[PDB]
């Protein structure tokens, strides 16, 4: 009568039942109109007696655990307008008799276990507005031609299904359709030109299919188009110039296709464009200056293409740009200082180009720039002192250039700087003490430079994890202060001029996985405390030095060490201390003064006879 969830007619008969989110279990009045049992965690099949309520205009079974078929009897309900079966375990085909529900408007099948094809019957439903069957992995076959007959369709989505083949030319008859969502599916073949007949189309999402052919020109005649996602297909040919005729277009994603040709000039006419992703294609030509007319661009990603020429200075007119990725192209010329006029830039990646000249200091005045990636170019000149103005810098990669001069002290003003790679450059001088001021610094890669001078523990921040100073001119002694970095994981000092002993303070680096001291002037005796780091796992490289004395007994403790190179030293005595490392994989003992017999165990038998031949007395004794 009046209780909670019940509604009645004017003649006094129960007309409605609504139950939402009550936490139940299990399975489940001929005047009924609306029936909602939803979010009740119900189970079992849908009883086929549902087809007995003839006045039902709404059936919502959504957000349950229901299983089995969608009973054919459900389609006996001739007055049904909404059918909501989504978010269940429902299996089987969508029955042909679905074409019988003459006045269906809403049809929600999404997120189920459904299979088979979509019935040619859907064409009969001429009041159908919304069809969403997506998220059924096994829904297969071609979208039927008859879909063209549902002329009230405003929304179609079939996403994450096995729907395949090519979209039918019939689609051009849906003159009211607004969103088409069929993505992460099996679609192949070309987008039909007839799609340009969908005059109300706003959102077209075809991404992650096998779609082939070229983007049809006809798409330019769609005046209501806002978002176009065609990323990750097989698309071929040139970007249609006519795309620049859709005034309302704010998002274009063509990434990861086979596109060629040029970025079209007509794009300047798109006054609403906020996001352009062309990443991973074959696009040639230069970035057209008219693109700088797109006042609203936040995201520009043109990376992994064939683009040539210079980055235009009129870039300064994009005052909303937060993201610029051109990496892996043929770009040449200077990086324009005018790029510093886009004050919102969060991320710049120009890596893998031919850019040359100085890095303009103005770019370091950006207060929001978190990522600056210029690696692998022809850049040169100094790192500007202005680097310290760039307050939010997080990840900085300058590596693989010609940069000269010394690392400016003002880098120490950057408190958010996490990761810095300046490797492969011409940098000179000392590592500046002020870098101690980068309190967030985790990764530091200076390798393959002309750096020199000494090395102080006071010079480095204790939050360091990865250090690579290799292939430089560094000298004097490894500072005892090295013991203060307790977080240090990989440490690579190789191919330098370093000398003296290994300071025993090394033992207090409790996290150290990798230590490369190779190709230096280190001398004396490998300290016992070097055994004292059980975290040493990945590799320990002491080779090409002047070390003497024996392998300290404590090396029996490094039970995790996979790779050990002591080669090319003056080391003496035998290998017995090593016989017990079962995790030792690679051992290079060659070019030393070792003598004595190795056991015949398979590991020592593995060692190349030529490695034994460069020592004093080493041989395999048979037990």
């Amino acid at each position: 009568c009046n209780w909670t969830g019940v509604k009645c007619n004017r003649r006094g008969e129960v007309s409605e039942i609504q139950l939402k989110e009550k936490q139940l279990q299990g399975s489940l009045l001929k005047s009924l109109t609306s029936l909602t049992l939803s979010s009740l965690q119900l189970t079992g099949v849908i009883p086929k007696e549902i087809g007995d309520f003839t006045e039902l205009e709404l059936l919502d079974l959504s957000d349950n655990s229901l299983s089995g078929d969608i009973p054919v009897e459900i389609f006996r309900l001739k007055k049904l307008k909404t059918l909501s079966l989504n978010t269940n375990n429902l299996e089987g085909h969508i029955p042909m008799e679905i074409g019988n529900l003459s006045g269906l408007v809403e049809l929600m099948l999404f997120d189920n276990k459904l299979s088979g094809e979509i019935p040619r019957s859907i064409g009969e439903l001429k009041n159908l507005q919304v069809l969403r069957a997506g998220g059924n992995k096994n829904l297969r076959g071609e979208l039927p031609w008859e879909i063209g007959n549902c002329e009230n369709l405003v929304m179609l989505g079939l996403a994450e299904t096995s729907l395949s083949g090519k979209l039918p030319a019939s689609i051009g008859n849906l003159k009211r359709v607004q969103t088409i969502a069929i993505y992460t599916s099996l679609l192949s073949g070309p987008i039909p030109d007839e799609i340009g007949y969908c005059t109300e189309l706003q959102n077209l999402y075809l991404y992650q299919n096998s779609i082939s052919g070229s983007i049809p020109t006809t798409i330019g005649g769609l005046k209501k188009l806002q978002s176009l996602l065609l990323w990750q297909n097989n698309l071929v040919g040139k970007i249609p110039t006519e795309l620049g005729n859709c005034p309302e277009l704010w998002l274009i994603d063509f990434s990861e296709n086979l596109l060629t040709g040029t970025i079209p000039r007509s794009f300047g006419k798109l006054e609403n464009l906020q996001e352009l992703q062309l990443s991973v294609n074959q696009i040639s030509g230069t970035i057209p200056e008219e693109l700088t007319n797109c006042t609203k661009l936040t995201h520009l990603e043109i990376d992994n293409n064939l683009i040539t020429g210079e980055i235009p200075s009129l870039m300064s007119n994009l005052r909303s740009l937060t993201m610029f990725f051109a990496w892996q192209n043929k770009l040449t010329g200077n990086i324009p200082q005018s790029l510093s006029q886009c004050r919102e830039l969060q991320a710049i990646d120009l890596s893998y180009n031919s850019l040359s000249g100085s890095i303009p200091k103005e770019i370091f005045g950006l207060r929001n720039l978190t990522k600056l990636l210029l690696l692998s170019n022809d850049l040169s000149g100094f790192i500007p002192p202005d680097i310290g103005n760039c307050t939010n810098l997080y990840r900085l990669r300058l590596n693989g250039n010609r940069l000269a001069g010394s690392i400016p002290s003002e880098i120490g003003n950057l408190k958010n700087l996490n990761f810095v790679d300046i490797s492969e450059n011409r940098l000179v001088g000392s590592i500046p003490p002020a870098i101690s001021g980068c309190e967030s610094l985790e990764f530091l890669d200076l390798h393959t430079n002309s750096l020199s001078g000494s090395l102080l523990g006071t010079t480095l921040p204790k939050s360091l994890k990865f250090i690579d100073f290799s292939d430089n001119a560094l000298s004097s002694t490894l500072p005892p202060g090295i013991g203060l970095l307790t977080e240090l994981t990989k440490l690579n000092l190789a191919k330098n001029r370093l000398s003296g002993e290994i300071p025993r303070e090394i033992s207090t680096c409790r996290s150290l996985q990798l230590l490369n001291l190779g190709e230096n002037d280190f001398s004396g005796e490998i300290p016992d405390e070097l055994g004292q780091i059980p975290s040493l796992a990945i590799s320990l490289n002491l080779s090409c030095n002047r070390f003497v004395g024996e392998i300290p007994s404590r090396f029996s403790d490094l039970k995790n060490l996979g790779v050990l190179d002591v080669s090319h030293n003056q080391l003496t005595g035998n290998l017995n201390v090593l016989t017990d490392l079962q995790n030792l994989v690679s051992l290079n003992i060659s070019y030393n003064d070792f003598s004595g017999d190795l056991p015949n165990t398979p590991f020592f038998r593995r060692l190349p006879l030529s490695d034994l031949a460069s020592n004093r007395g080493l041989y395999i004794s048979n037990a």
Binding site: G134, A159, W231, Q277
Partner: peptide, 13 residues
């Protein structure tokens, strides 16, 4: 549940 519409994820170095 199937994923909502997304753009191509951006990749940086």
């Amino acid at each position: 549940d199937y994923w909502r519409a997304k753009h191509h994820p951006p990749k940086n170095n």
